[PDB]
Design a binder for this molecule. Structure first.
Ligand SMILES: CO[C@@H]1[C@H](O)[C@@H](OC)[C@H](O[C@@H](C)[C@@H](O)/C=C/C=C/C=C/C(=O)[C@@H](C)[C@@H](O)[C@H](C)[C@@H]2C/C=C/C=C/C=C/[C@H](O)C(=O)/C(C)=C/C=C/C(C)=C/[C@@H](O)/C(C)=C/CC(=O)O2)O[C@@H]1C
Ligand SMILES: Nc1nc2c(ncn2[C@@H]2O[C@H](COP(=O)(O)OP(=O)(O)NP(=O)(O)O)[C@@H](O)[C@H]2O)c(=O)[nH]1
Ligand SMILES: [Mg+2]
Lengths: 261, 367
């Protein structure tokens, strides 16, 4: 539990810059990544850019809408060719079709159910195949968007029509959110972020504008606070006033990430 | 005669491009002794003479960088062994592919602040992965370690790393004699108007053979004009005919400064043709590549760059896509407002207010 090669490697992969600078800032955090990331941002040398646990693997992302229930999953393969051989690409659908009809949020069930065809396909294609994760989303009006094969997204709402629910999904896939409104942000997240902005150093007159930067950050991690992608001149929390609607939930899937509840 | 090849430094900002250039000359000069108009440097390995040009590694100073990248037949990628690959490091490489650059050699500069060996393997792996991605033979690309600063003064050891590097200049980079044997083609760099001679346009001969006394075919921006080659002269001395690879000037009896402009194409009568609508592959730069930060849609009006000119065009993505994000690479159609000479297999680029957008190749011409 000290300094390894894969330790400073990932830190840079979620930093974007400074190879040797990472290890120097990491060893100051005595081995902790999240402590280093804080210190690196509080150093005034990091443009945030924190990408939580970038696995950087290769696979497929598929989605399927069905009235109230929408199931999305992630199936990691090997090379980019394996993802587009139409045999494994259809195999993932076979896993999806039985997952949606079975409404499974327990990924372990899909494992055993398709472990037979998995090894059968692995031995036939010579590529190690694995089903990573799968989640679901209940809502009135569902809508999905497949930004290629690497990224998929499920969005449910109540009031938005067939087109409005799709355009929102594209924004979720684009500007990566984390909450709906700035109100429903965990105080555990706010406080730990508050210490970052506050540690940036005017006395007692710059403190108040720093807490104002929090109000710009809370809109940045939210979705209603985030500016639209089709037209960033306006936000989103003023865009639900079109056909009078409201977003229920959000699901964003990218080949990688994860390791978080 | 002793064949000579144009080279030059390239890479991320203050990684050590200029100081390496100073090192290479200083070392090669104290070791031996016995076609470019820009601010350059020259040194001789016992094998070849070398015309070296340093380029600034800032994201904004990609101006004379691309100009230099075009002229050089080999680039010397300067990567800090400490910081590692940075947006401009991969920005330059991809631009390198778009603007010729036959071969590429990597120099792991600032290698005097790396005690940890595992860190050296990581950056070498990461670097070698970069150019392997941008259509360069990365898996077998010479990566030389060592320092430029310590090589500048004393240190027979660090000086050897420079001689090592220069050794690969002769080793890795072959003779770029292959150029002509095809229809003539030349972009315009500037348009001058001399009261005594007349009007001489500049630009490097991309390919083909041009002899003084032949016709031309001015294609681009405006109308397909046509004149006659009055003469060809290099630097200050005249020239009988002309050879590709070099950069000269051509006068046109009847054409003045206001009649012709920078960015057009001079070619053999009946070879290349102007177009506004074309088919392209188009890669798109990301954050790690110093490109777009936010995704755009089917309402995009950027600034396209072709050869020496730059045109403003629209977009038309295939029925099935509606959004492009910093990192995508989907084939699509762009309609320009100004006809520009092109053909099957032309590498271009897109830019928009500092942020260098992605770049791709032209599939097939249309209208
Ligand atoms: C005597 O007076 C006068 C003067 O002083 C003399 O000059 C010394 C002159 O002497 C003459 C006789 C004669 O000897 C002199 C001749 C001079 C010749 C000069 C030649 C050159 O510059 C050439 C390398 C360049 O154009 C070269 C083709 C150009 C150089 C072009 C550089 C372009 C830079 C743009 C950058 C953008 O911000 C950007 O952000 C971006 C990303 C752009 C995208 C670029 C891409 C991808 C382009 C490709 O589509 C491609 C492949 C481009 C290649 C290209 O076009 O290279 O006589 C005059 C009369
Ligand atoms: N220790 C050490 N420092 C170096 C080395 N190479 C460059 N530097 C340092 O890097 C800084 C910038 O050097 P420079 O050569 O100007 O970089 P550059 O790539 O030319 N910059 P640009 O391309 O923007 O003009 C200087 O402070 C110089 O001392 C090296 O090998 N070792
Ligand atoms: Mg420089």
């Amino acid at each position: 539990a000290e300094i390894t090669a894969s330790l400073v490697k990932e830190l840079r992969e979620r930093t974007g810059a400074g190879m040797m600078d990472c290890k120097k800032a990491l060893t100051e955090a005595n081995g902790d990544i999240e402590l280093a990331i804080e210190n690196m941002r509080k150093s005034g040398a990091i443009k945030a850019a924190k990408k939580a646990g970038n696995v950087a693997a290769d696979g497929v992302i598929k989605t399927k809408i069905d009235g109230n229930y929408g199931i999305i999953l992630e199936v990691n393969c090997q090379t980019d060719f394996v993802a587009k051989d139409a045999g494994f690409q259809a195999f993932a659908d076979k896993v999806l079709d039985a997952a949606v009809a079975g409404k499974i949020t327990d990924v372990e069930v899909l494992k055993a159910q398709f472990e037979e065809e998995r090894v059968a396909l692995v031995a036939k294609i010579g590529e190690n195949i694995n089903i990573r994760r799968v989640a679901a989303l209940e809502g009135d009006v569902l809508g999905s968007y497949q930004h290629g094969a690497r990224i998929g997204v499920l969005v449910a709402a109540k009031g938005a029509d067939e087109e409005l629910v799709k355009h929102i999904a594209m924004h979720v896939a684009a500007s990566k959110p984390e909450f709906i409104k700035p109100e429903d942000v965990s105080a555990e997240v706010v406080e730990k972020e508050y210490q970052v902005q506050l540690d940036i150093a005017p006395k007692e007159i710059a403190e108040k504008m720093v807490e104002g930067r929090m109000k710009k950050f809370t809109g940045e991690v939210s979705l209603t606070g985030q500016p639209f992608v089709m037209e960033p001149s306006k936000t989103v929390g003023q865009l639900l006033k079109e056909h009078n609607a409201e977003v229920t939930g959000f699901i964003r899937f990218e080949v990688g990430e994860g390791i978080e509840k | 005669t002793k064949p000579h090849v144009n080279v030059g430094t390239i890479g991320h900002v203050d990684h050590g491009k200029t100081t390496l250039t100073a090192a290479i000359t200083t070392v090669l000069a104290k070791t031996y002794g016995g076609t470019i108009n820009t601010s350059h440097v020259e040194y001789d390995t016992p094998t070849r003479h070398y015309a070296h040009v340093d380029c600034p590694g800032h994201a904004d100073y990609v101006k004379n960088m691309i100009t230099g990248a075009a002229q050089m037949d080999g680039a010397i990628l300067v990567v800090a062994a400490t910081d590692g690959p940075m947006p401009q490091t991969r920005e330059h490489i991809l631009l390198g592919r778009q603007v010729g650059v036959p071969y590429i050699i990597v120099f792991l500069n600032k290698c005097d602040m790396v005690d940890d060996e595992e860190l050296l393997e990581l950056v070498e792996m990461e670097v070698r992965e970069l150019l392997s991605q941008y259509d360069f033979p990365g898996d077998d690309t010479p990566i030389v370690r060592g320092s430029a600063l310590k090589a500048l003064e004393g240190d027979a050891e660090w000086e050897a790393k420079i001689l090592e590097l220069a050794g690969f200049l002769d080793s890795y980079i072959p003779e770029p004699e292959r150029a002509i044997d095809k229809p003539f083609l030349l972009p315009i760099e500037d348009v001058f108007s001399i009261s005594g001679r007349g009007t001489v346009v500049t630009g490097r001969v991309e390919r083909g053979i041009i002899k003084v006394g032949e016709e031309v075919e001015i294609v681009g921006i405006k109308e397909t004009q046509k004149s006659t080659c009055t003469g060809v002269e290099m630097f200050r001395k005249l020239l009988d005919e002309g050879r590709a690879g070099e950069n000269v000037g051509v006068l046109l009896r009847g054409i003045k400064r206001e009649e012709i402009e920078r960015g057009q194409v001079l070619a053999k009568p009946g070879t290349i043709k102007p177009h506004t609508k074309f088919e392209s592959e188009v890669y798109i730069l990301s954050k790690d590549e110093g490109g777009r930060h936010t995704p755009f849609f089917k309402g995009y009006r950027p600034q396209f760059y072709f050869r020496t000119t730059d045109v403003t065009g629209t977009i038309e993505l295939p029925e099935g896509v509606e959004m492009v994000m910093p990192g995508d690479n989907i084939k699509m159609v762009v309609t320009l407002i100004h006809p520009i000479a092109m053909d099957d297999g032309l590498r271009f680029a897109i830019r928009e207010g500092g942020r260098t957008v992605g770049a791709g190749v032209v599939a097939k011409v249309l209208g």
